[PDB]
Amino acid sequence: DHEAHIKVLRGEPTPEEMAALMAVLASAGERNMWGHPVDKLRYSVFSWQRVTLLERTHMRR
Amino acid sequence: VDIHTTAGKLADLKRRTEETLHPVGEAAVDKVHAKGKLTARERILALLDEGSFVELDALAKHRSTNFGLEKNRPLGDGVITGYGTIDGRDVCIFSQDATVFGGSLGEVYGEKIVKVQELAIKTG
Amino acid sequence: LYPVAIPEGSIEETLTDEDLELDTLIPDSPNQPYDMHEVITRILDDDEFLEVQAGYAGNIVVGFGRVEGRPVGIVANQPTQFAGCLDINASEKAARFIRTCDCFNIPIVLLVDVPGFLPGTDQEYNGIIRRGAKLLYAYGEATVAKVTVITRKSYGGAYCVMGSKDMGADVVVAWPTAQIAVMGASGAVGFVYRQQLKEAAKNGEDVDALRLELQQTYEDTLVNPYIAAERGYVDAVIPPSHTRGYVANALRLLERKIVQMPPKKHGNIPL
Amino acid sequence: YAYGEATVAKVTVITRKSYGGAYCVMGSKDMGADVVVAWPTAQIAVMGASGAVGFVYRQQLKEAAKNGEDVDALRLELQQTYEDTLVNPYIAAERGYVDAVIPPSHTRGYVANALRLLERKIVQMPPKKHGNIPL
Amino acid sequence: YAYGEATVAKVTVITRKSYGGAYCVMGSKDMGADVVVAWPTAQIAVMGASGAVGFVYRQQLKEAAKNGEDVDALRLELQQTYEDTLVNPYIAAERGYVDAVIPPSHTRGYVANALRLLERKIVQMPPKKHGNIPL
Amino acid sequence: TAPMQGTVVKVAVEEGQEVSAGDLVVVLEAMKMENPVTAHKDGTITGLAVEAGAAITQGTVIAEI
Amino acid sequence: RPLIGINDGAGARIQEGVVSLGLYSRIFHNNIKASGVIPQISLIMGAAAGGHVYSPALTDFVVMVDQTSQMFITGPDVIKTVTGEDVTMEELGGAHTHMAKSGTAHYVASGEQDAFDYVRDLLSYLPPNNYADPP
């Protein structure tokens, strides 16, 4: 098991103290490109950002 | 309350608002219930999520003076317009009201529908 | 954006104790000013208002805040200095603040209580026309979400400048105390009833008592929000306590907004 | 702002004086002046000589003051030195801020040539909704 | 849908009738007609006067029928008054839906000149894939 | 200083009247507004140069602080 | 295509109420949209009071008539009421005042013909729109 667990580095609780600890810690613990700013920017007809910003935004998933 | 006071102006607003609920008198709403149909407001509040409805141009009144229409200026001109949510997603809505001049489309009635259309398109 | 939990329920249902303090803020006497920070700090989240150019032109207050975690740029008239009039300095202050917000997509809320432009020959010679046109241009150019709350007064050309509907204000709401008019009744009586009635008072009438009567009549009839609401220049007339709800809800609606402009290399802002 | 952002052809003819930050404002090369030409009378300097000298030779003037020398005659001699050495177009030309130092008669030809060639400058600035101008 | 999506130069000449919804299916100003001109014989109305009267004066026809009057003579008189007053281009021209009321002979001139003016035309529409025309 | 010409309808500071920064010093009816003028700085406000009913002119010294 | 506005008006028509301010706002918003799109030129031929000032300010060029044209936000009567300052309309907002003091006018014509000539001279240099090359 490669999950990252909680670890009590120091001391031992009794089972009741462990139950309190864990209950407390547990109790504490779609694209919509419409009007994206990149559409609002004004580009030169030859601006490379039409590739590297605009398409790289609209196409990106 | 003295209309020259903030308190009086607030109460006047609330009064006008109440009047908007039944702009041609409660008797028409009663007749529609006797007919078993929902009024345009009940229809909007049924379709949208409860309390989500925000109303635009409630206090509107038509501007016509032809053939004595100036003698009767129902609040809202016979359409209820605004936005709200369905299942928590925003939608723009209008609801035409048969009891006001039949429901026939007027100037303000059209301007209100236009406003809602424009807002819907703008906001997507 | 910061995460913040919106309460469930209507604007009426979710009114706080503090919202209700707006219902009584506006003095009954139209000559008594009030401090617009009282509105700003109650509209904003956490009272966190970061004012910009706090000292430059006190008749308009501009600055950042948040409304449900979304940053907002507030701009607001301030009755405690020059009766809240627009002047050159305030116009340049708000024009450049608006354009700074618009460059960075920060939505704008206007709080309006403007009687008009500050009268003076020095303002005229210093270019109130050319330099006041900057705020009008910057507001019209701005394509962010723009919301207007009208608190007491919005007269003449300053109604246009302070984000009228046709300037592309998205949601405009008025408090019941709002006063939208071409000018004050004191002036309007001297046109709409001058030409026949007040000059015909030379028949021998008590002309000052007639003027006061006609002022009261005009104020009652026309110096109110409802004539603008009957034309859609105001989308809703709301209790002041509703303002925080309405502004937050409008900003959530407008957060994604497309407006179409003609093609240009840049605009020719008055400067 | 207006000059830096302008993407039309920008031609600068430096007729006589061009000092300090006003050299930056009145169409510096690094602002993107497409052609910068200077007449022989052009005087391109950080500072007018009389002001410059006080900084450039401050210590020498202070020494002459404590030696009790003719401070004004020394200022005049250092000023004529500074003026003849640096208050001229050629230092800018050397740095290449002036593309050519031209007889004035050439001006109209240089302008016509530049404006004919620069009809469609392929130049751009980063994408933006608009600019935030000092207003 | 076709006329509303049509972004080309759209000109309308009204000759005689333009009633009801057909005034909208034929191209009105709010459907984005670029120039709308009417001949004097144009008749722009919600419906023909014979139908209009039965609504607009229904109360007068009612009281005339209770009085037993010559309701057909009243019908004719009211219809005449309606047609004289409203069923003409001028009401629309006043409301700005007709840009000019022209002598018919001018029509060729107006069409030619408007098409020349509209040779270049930009119209901004929301971004879409395609339109979903009603079929 | 009175920021514009107006009727001094109320004077708010006394003699030595030590005045804190931002305190209201005068009420000045101008432009149909009870415009306050306030103390820019905190200190003594002994002298005063305003009386009720006076049409105080722009730039008139109200008080020295 | 270029837009010429010839301006002459005592501000808003007080009887029509807020309507005039809505239509002013719309005219301004169109001037802002057109800003930098098409040449806008304003000829000021009389009293341009109130809201009539801001349209010219938003247009690209202002041509005024030496003494028959005036432009001001607030009337002298209001200025007197609030400040007592006595000025004529001509001292307040005459063409000389707007050329020399506030820098709002771009030309001051000796007369209407000279103004028209100036506007034709401007249009002789300006292209019809920003996507057109100058003539």
**Which has the closest alpha carbon to C176: C10, C18, C26, C19?**
C26
Buried b (16+ CB within 10 A) or exposed e, B90-113: bbbbbbbbebbbeeeebebbebbe
Q: Are C75 and C108 in contact (CB under 8 A)?
A: yes
Q: Are G14 and C188 in contact (CB under 8 A)?
A: yes
The SS3 call for residue D18 is strand
Helix or strand holding residue D11 (H, E): strand D11-14
Q: What are C64's two structure tokens?
A: 């950042």
Calpha distance G30→C167 (Å, rounded): 9
The answer to whether the Cβ–Cβ distance between C256 and A37 falls below 8 Å is no
Q: What are C169's two structure tokens?
A: 């204000």
What chain B residue is nearest to C169 in terms of C-alpha separation? B119
What chain F residue is nearest to C116 in terms of C-alpha separation? F31
Measure in Å the smallest separation between the Cα of C171 and chain A Cα atoms. Answer: 18
G78 contacts on F by Cβ (under 8 Å): none
List Cβ neighbours of E116 (8 Å cut-off, separation of 6 or more).
none
Calpha distance G53→G99 (Å, rounded): 15
Q: Select from A37, A40, A44 the Cβ nearest to the Cβ of D124.
A: A44
Binding-face residues of A in 2-31 toward B, CB within 8 A: none
List Cβ neighbours of C133 (8 Å cut-off, separation of 6 or more).
C270, G54, G57, G58
Q: Are B90 and C225 in contact (CB under 8 A)?
A: no
Rg (CA), chain G: 16
Calpha distance C80→C59 (Å, rounded): 7
Calpha distance C103→A41 (Å, rounded): 9
Calpha distance A59→A33 (Å, rounded): 10
Q: What are D129's two structure tokens?
A: 């909704």
Alpha carbons within 13 angstroms on the beta-carbon side of residue C45 total 17
List Cβ neighbours of C218 (8 Å cut-off, separation of 6 or more).
C185, C188, C189, C192
Enter the DSSP assignment of C209: H
**Which has the closest alpha carbon to G122: G66, G34, G61?**
G61
G24 contacts on C by Cβ (under 8 Å): 157, 160
Calpha distance G22→G56 (Å, rounded): 18
Q: What are C76's two structure tokens?
A: 């607001």
**Which has the closest alpha carbon to B10: D127, C88, C240?**
C240
Calpha distance D78→D84 (Å, rounded): 10
Which residue of A42, A45, A46 to mutate against C (max C Cβ within 10 Å)? A42
Calpha distance C101→C50 (Å, rounded): 14
What chain D residue is nearest to C133 in terms of C-alpha separation? D135
Q: Are C145 and C255 in contact (CB under 8 A)?
A: yes
Alpha carbons within 13 angstroms on the beta-carbon side of residue C252 total 20
Q: What are C58's two structure tokens?
A: 């006190």
- Tokens 């034929």, located at residue: E26
Calpha distance E106→G78 (Å, rounded): 51
Distance, first Cα to last Cα, chain A? 32
Report yes or no: A35 at the D interface, CB cutoff 8 Å.
Answer: no
Calpha distance G39→G62 (Å, rounded): 12
Strands (E), D20-104: 35-38, 43-45, 100-101
F35 contacts on C by Cβ (under 8 Å): 33, 80-83
A32 contacts on B by Cβ (under 8 Å): 124
The SS3 call for residue D122 is coil
Q: What are C114's two structure tokens?
A: 């403007």
Distance, first Cα to last Cα, chain C? 34
Q: What are G76's two structure tokens?
A: 């002298």
A34 contacts on B by Cβ (under 8 Å): 124
The answer to whether the Cβ–Cβ distance between C103 and D130 falls below 8 Å is yes
List Cβ neighbours of B76 (8 Å cut-off, separation of 6 or more).
B20, B23, B57, B58, B59, B60, B97, B100
The SS3 call for residue C65 is strand
List Cβ neighbours of C75 (8 Å cut-off, separation of 6 or more).
C60, C61, C62, C94, C97, C98, C108, C109, C110, C111
Report yes or no: C137 at the G interface, CB cutoff 8 Å.
Answer: yes
Calpha distance B22→B51 (Å, rounded): 19
How many residue pairs from chains C and E have C-beta atoms closer than 8 A? Answer: 9
Q: What angle do CA A36, A42, A47 make, to 5 degrees?
A: 105
Q: Are C57 and C20 in contact (CB under 8 A)?
A: no
Calpha distance C105→C95 (Å, rounded): 15
Calpha distance C67→C4 (Å, rounded): 10
Q: Which residues of C touch F (CB under 8 A)?
A: 29-33, 79-83, 85, 115, 184, 186
Q: What are E51's two structure tokens?
A: 């139908």
User: Dihedrals φ, ψ of E116, to 5°?
Assistant: -60, -45
Calpha distance E103→E100 (Å, rounded): 10
Cα C136 to its chain centre, rounded Å, is 13
- Tokens 């000279």, located at residue: G114
The answer to whether the Cβ–Cβ distance between F31 and C33 falls below 8 Å is no
The answer to whether the Cβ–Cβ distance between D135 and C269 falls below 8 Å is yes
What chain F residue is nearest to G85 in terms of C-alpha separation? F5
Helix or strand holding residue C161 (H, E): helix C156-161
Measure in Å the smallest separation between the Cα of D134 and chain A Cα atoms. Answer: 20
Report yes or no: C230 at the G interface, CB cutoff 8 Å.
Answer: no
Amino acid at B122: K
Between the CA of residue G90 and those of C124, G43, G67, what are the distances in Å? 12, 17, 7
C143 contacts on A by Cβ (under 8 Å): 40
Calpha distance E132→G50 (Å, rounded): 48
Q: Select from G36, G57, G93 the Cβ nearest to the Cβ of C133.
A: G57
The answer to whether the Cβ–Cβ distance between C141 and D130 falls below 8 Å is yes
Whether chains B and F touch (3+ CB pairs under 8 A) is answered by no
Between the CA of residue D108 and those of C15, D96, D114, what are the distances in Å? 73, 21, 10
Chains that touch B (3 or more CB pairs under 8 A): A, C
- Other CB atoms within 10 A of residue C143 CB: 18
Measure in Å the smallest separation between the Cα of A4 and chain D Cα atoms. Answer: 45
Strands (E), C156-257: 171-174, 180-181, 236-237
Calpha distance F64→F45 (Å, rounded): 6
Pairing of strands C146-155, C180-181: parallel
Calpha distance A16→B68 (Å, rounded): 84
**Which has the closest alpha carbon to C249: F55, E88, B49?**
B49
Calpha distance C129→G55 (Å, rounded): 10
Q: What is the DSSP string of A33-58?
A: -TT-HHHHSB--TT-THIIIIIIHHH
Q: What is the DSSP string of G92-105?
A: HHBHHHHHHTS---
The SS3 call for residue C85 is coil
Report yes or no: C143 at the A interface, CB cutoff 8 Å.
Answer: yes
Calpha distance E37→E103 (Å, rounded): 10
Which residue of C91, C93, C101, C103 to mutate against D (max D Cβ within 10 Å)? C103
Q: Are C271 and C203 in contact (CB under 8 A)?
A: no
Q: Are B101 and B67 in contact (CB under 8 A)?
A: no
Buried b (16+ CB within 10 A) or exposed e, E14-51: beebbeeeebeeebbbebebbbbbbbeebbbbeebbee
Q: Are C186 and C163 in contact (CB under 8 A)?
A: no
The answer to whether the Cβ–Cβ distance between C157 and G24 falls below 8 Å is yes
Q: Is C39 exposed, middle or buried (0-12, 13-18, 19+ CB in 10 A)?
A: buried
E124 contacts on C by Cβ (under 8 Å): 260-262
Q: What is the DSSP string of G49-117?
A: EGGGGHHHHHSSEEEEETTT-EEESS-HHHHHHHH-----HHHHHBHHHHHHTS---SEEESSHHHHHH
List Cβ neighbours of B122 (8 Å cut-off, separation of 6 or more).
C170, C257, C258, C259
**Which has the closest alpha carbon to E100: E112, E109, E110, E86?**
E110
Measure in Å the smallest separation between the Cα of B80 and chain A Cα atoms. Answer: 27
Q: Are G2 and G128 in contact (CB under 8 A)?
A: yes
What chain C residue is nearest to A43 in terms of C-alpha separation? C265
Calpha distance F58→G16 (Å, rounded): 36
Report yes or no: A32 at the B interface, CB cutoff 8 Å.
Answer: yes
The SS3 call for residue C17 is coil
Q: What angle do CA C243, C246, C252 make, to 5 degrees?
A: 140
Helix or strand holding residue C94 (H, E): helix C88-103
